[model samples]
Target: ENNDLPSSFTGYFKKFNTGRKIISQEILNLIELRMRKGNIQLTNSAISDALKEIDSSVLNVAVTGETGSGKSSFINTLRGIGNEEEGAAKTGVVEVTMERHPYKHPNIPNVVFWDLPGIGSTNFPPDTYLEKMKFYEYDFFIIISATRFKKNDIDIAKAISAMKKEFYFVRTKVDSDITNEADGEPQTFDKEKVLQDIRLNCVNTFRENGIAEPPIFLLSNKNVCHYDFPVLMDKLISDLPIYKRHNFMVSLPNITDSVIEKKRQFLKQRIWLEGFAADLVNIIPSLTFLLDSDLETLKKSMKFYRTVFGVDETSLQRLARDWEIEVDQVEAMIKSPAVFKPTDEETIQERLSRYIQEFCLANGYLLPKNSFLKEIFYLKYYFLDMVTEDAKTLLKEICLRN
Candidate 1:
């Protein structure tokens, strides 16, 4: 009896009529709840609260190592910021962190990277360092070292394990080691062999210190995308809970094509949640109230998508500055129209209006309420997909150039 829905419509929305995928079951639950009630009476507060739940996950990571072991630079690199950038963790050849400092990711505010003072220093001896640092506060710990693992480091790991906490051993400054080894004899030096030697040396050092097996990740603070950085990230995410894993994956720096793709896929899984919200707002009785809430929700989600995919203007500008190239060089690589634009109220409103007009023109007639709702949902989904693809393209270009 509903003209809005087609005969074959089973209350599932797709990405712009492409039946390759269906909206998540959460959206279906919403649709069923709305239909069973026979009234579109959901409050905006309830809706906003649910949207907030998706982003409320918090991930706390503790990064600790000996003084001058590249922990500070690693934290900054993880946040996609330079040492000199605003809100970046201070990096120096000597120890800078005297105490625990929580450095929140600028883009993903829910994830905080805690930079702890160097362990085993004279000021904080290995005996009571873990207790002093409040080691239990972190969800996980990364123990980094520039060279081989020391006795103090192994002791810390055993203590952390005793407390039933997870820890990872990261060998930092691998690029420096490679350069040093290849300095005099580039032709004779095998980069892979050097890397193997470093891994073997770290493993042997751990075994010598009474640790049976230690998972070691080798990476350079200067270039996180290369070497074992991706493997480290994979292990970290795999070891975390689903919610924390999602947060960590989204908050990661989009430095590699694989990272960009992973981010895209993770964000893709949440599209239905956003789309359902918009669909519910579309069915509301009052046009004026519906437009206000719908536009605000749309704008909020669009902004989040742009930021997550590194397509926002600020992110692009930062990339260009870091790469020491013109902004156009970065912007030109993005093919999505939704990216590289200001997320001001006026701009977002105008962009939504254009998409609305386009949907109407494509259909050739005003769609009924439910179909209209479906179209609105599809519009946002399409935009998200476009921006994600563009991010992959831009990341590849940047990495290739670098």
Candidate 2:
């Protein structure tokens, strides 16, 4: 084989080549396994091994605010769901999240989101609300409101500050408020000024409550595309502990299921050929060789584009908000090209392809191989086949309703 033998075997050979005695039980298993079944591919086992190499501390994020402050919709967005979907976060005029309940991303279970009940109920005061809710359990908090800051909102903010946990103020429902203000204004309403005015209002409220420098994020759940969701995500990533950042990065749904499938196949081969084949033949390969750059060519491109384009929940939301467009509309714009790439759609097509290829490399190959990879890969490919009628399915489903 032109390709070097698996890493595990290489390690044993290296010792033998050096004329140094070495224990080589690990490589013995590979020789027996590979020769007996030359084409026997252990794909899932490789994926599982890759996953173990990543840092262990994933994060748990909590979202809380006043009743009807758009916390539920924010929760949905974090879970990769948008508003106007049938089974999104249950949002109504009255409180829907009865108790402190947890909802994980349907696609990435690791990104746990607790849609906590809003503060200022008859049972719980703002001062002690967070303490009572096991606030320490979460790594961070997203406090949201659609209107002017209420006492409940201030209370939650106060509690978050006292606890010394990261808390972001999300001013929600900007679209409706902007529209109402526009109808009443005598002069042409400036969008930037209106958005700034709303942000200042929240800042002033927090200042009054002894929070001099409150971190704020402006958002309109109704129009996620034209809001500050992207900025919010940037701020969160910058502030979040290093270990938790990758989980957030990987948690986003594949922009299209077709991408997921191609990734699935690429991943299927990687697990067997790259991950286990190397490790089985060389159990004692230097961890540096494994972690420093295993299958990084594909993953490096994915990370590059992810950083360059900023396509995660936060960035996608902000792009729409800044453009004053709908979140789904933006998704439609990006996804259309992936589904039907025209000659002029070079940029979009390349971006989607890069994204899918990276996703496969990252989620499928980069991590330590573990059972989780097998399950997730199965789900991704199953959806991919269902969505597209043919192989090499070009259609991308960026923002799916289901």
Candidate 3:
């Protein structure tokens, strides 16, 4: 068996072994109790179902503050939608988000941001605000204010605390503050000092209101890459449940190189699990009919990768337009053919078969009992790396131009 196994197959086998070593104890249980049951088809189905749940998991984040808090702008930024785009949360100088409006992410439909009405607006006071908004339904709450953290925000935070739910405080329009602060003193302007003062003021306000050690994030809707946006995202991910964390990470806008790299690394961590699922399906002799399903799984995963990395057609077009470049100019940076189009079952199987043939020819025999299965996983890993590199290149181009 060793003599017949190709170097490629051996390399992937080693990788799988190494991956198995670091897998959490919980996953070890799944491999032993689930994969070791010798029912490859059943195991494959379970993986597919579990992946579906992860992909389709719903996360409702409620955005609320007093009137004119820029709640709609924040929601639009989070969902990767322009304020004027279709399906975007309405924005205006006045109270546009009067009612609770659920604005789903443009690309990721399962992750929704509820644009809740201003808590301390004349229509809804802090005492009855949570009840009226049906606060229990949201996974978390984000209280935003354009100026200071007001008493109404503090009241809402207390209410959320009583309900045992998480809430984040965001001080919006920091860009305007910074710009205004440094407008006349451009020669001696201290951006860092200005930011510190703003942050300290918010913190002090929260503490004065009896909310101790409150986490306050200062942000700008016009530029998410600046200020405390990344810090806010980190805290949200750390505080969120494990299953929902992936959705949050994937649904984030690819605004900066750091954000793109973060999402890329996040997806890379899951490729091994996805490849293991393909391996399980490949080993089942009776599950040949499900080959199409496995192909669909991979296609869906690649589609998600493209979307998150800002390589999808919609993303490319929007980005190109935003950067004042042609669509082809942006797409020319992509080196991965995997992101070009969807692959049907036949095409995927044919490609897999060709790789298997090459492996057999190189080894003079198919010695490994599951050489085909290992090859399928190798293909997935190989393409994941390729597409990720392509995404990095595309992002580099966009960043350079911007």
Q: Please give the CA lDDT of all the candidate structures.
A: 0.67, 0.53, 0.66
Error of 1 at 349 (Å): 8.3
Candidate achieving the largest lDDT? 1
Counting clashing residue pairs in each candidate, in order, gives: 0, 28, 0
Model 1, 221-310: lDDT tens digits are 777788898888877877775546667888888777777777766665555444444443344221222266566666676777778777
Write model 2 residue lDDT over 317-338, tens digit each, in one string.
5556756777676555443213
Best by TM-score: 3
2 or 3, greater by lDDT:
3
TM-score of each: 0.75, 0.54, 0.77
Candidate 1: which stretches are off by over 4 Å?
1-53, 92-97, 162-164, 184-188, 277-293, 322-329, 335-373
Clashing residue pairs in candidate 3 are: none
RMSD of each: 6.1, 13.6, 6.1
